[PDB]
Amino acid sequence: SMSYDIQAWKKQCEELLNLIFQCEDSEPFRQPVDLLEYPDYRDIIDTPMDFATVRETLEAGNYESPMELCKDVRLIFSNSKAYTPSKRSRIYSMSLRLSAFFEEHISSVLSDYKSALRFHKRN
Ligand SMILES: Cc1ccccc1NC(N)=S
């Protein structure tokens, strides 16, 4: 059970997603972009991603690890940098703040999970 629990990352990521939805900085990134308002979004972005999608994928049981979750969240940020490239944009700034918040918090979730992995593989 609790030390080196390889399932513990799920509730941790659920809690982090909760913090992210609270942050005013996540507002542009909560829901999928709308095609008909930004008709060019798909001209620029190959693989859309948003935090409601990540939260539903996690709820569905479709991430095998926290690294898979982290990949999808990092796609949100990389997509924002491609679509809104200008450092003058407030949206750019928001993206950067929220990325840094995510990367701070996910850090321990990842390290703990990989520790757990390393322990159970060794024993
Ligand atoms: C932040 C934003 C607002 C409106 C339209 C597009 C975007 N960019 C992404 N969601 S990647």
Side-chain angles (χ1 to χ4, degrees), residues 2-23 25-63 65-117 119-120 123:
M2 206 74 246
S3 300
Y4 297 140
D5 177 9
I6 80 318
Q7 299 313 314
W9 69 273
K10 300 173 185 183
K11 189 164 85 75
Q12 287 161 11
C13 282
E14 194 182 4
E15 287 166 349
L16 183 48
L17 291 166
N18 182 267
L19 298 178
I20 287 159
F21 275 84
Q22 292 188 45
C23 292
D25 289 344
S26 72
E27 192 283 324
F29 310 108
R30 293 172 193 152
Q31 333 87 151
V33 175
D34 199 73
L35 26 50
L36 217 328
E37 181 183 25
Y38 294 81
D40 72 339
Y41 189 73
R42 290 306 304 277
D43 300 331
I44 305 303
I45 297 302
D46 258 44
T47 309
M49 182 56 59
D50 64 279
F51 284 107
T53 300
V54 167
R55 172 176 75 175
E56 177 58 34
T57 304
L58 177 68
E59 181 66 48
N62 290 158
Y63 288 125
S65 72
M67 297 78 81
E68 290 190 340
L69 176 147
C70 182
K71 194 190 301 284
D72 276 349
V73 173
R74 287 168 176 171
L75 172 60
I76 295 164
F77 297 120
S78 72
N79 282 344
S80 177
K81 192 170 209 175
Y83 191 74
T84 301
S86 174
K87 312 203 189 318
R88 266 178 301 248
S89 171
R90 71 190 66 189
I91 299 297
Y92 185 100
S93 285
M94 285 173 74
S95 192
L96 280 204
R97 285 197 299 272
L98 186 69
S99 189
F101 180 88
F102 173 77
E103 293 285 349
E104 175 67 28
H105 276 93
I106 200 66
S107 196
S108 80
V109 174
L110 294 179
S111 61
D112 286 354
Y113 176 76
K114 284 171 169 186
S115 279
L117 235 53
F119 176 91
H120 289 99
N123 298 298

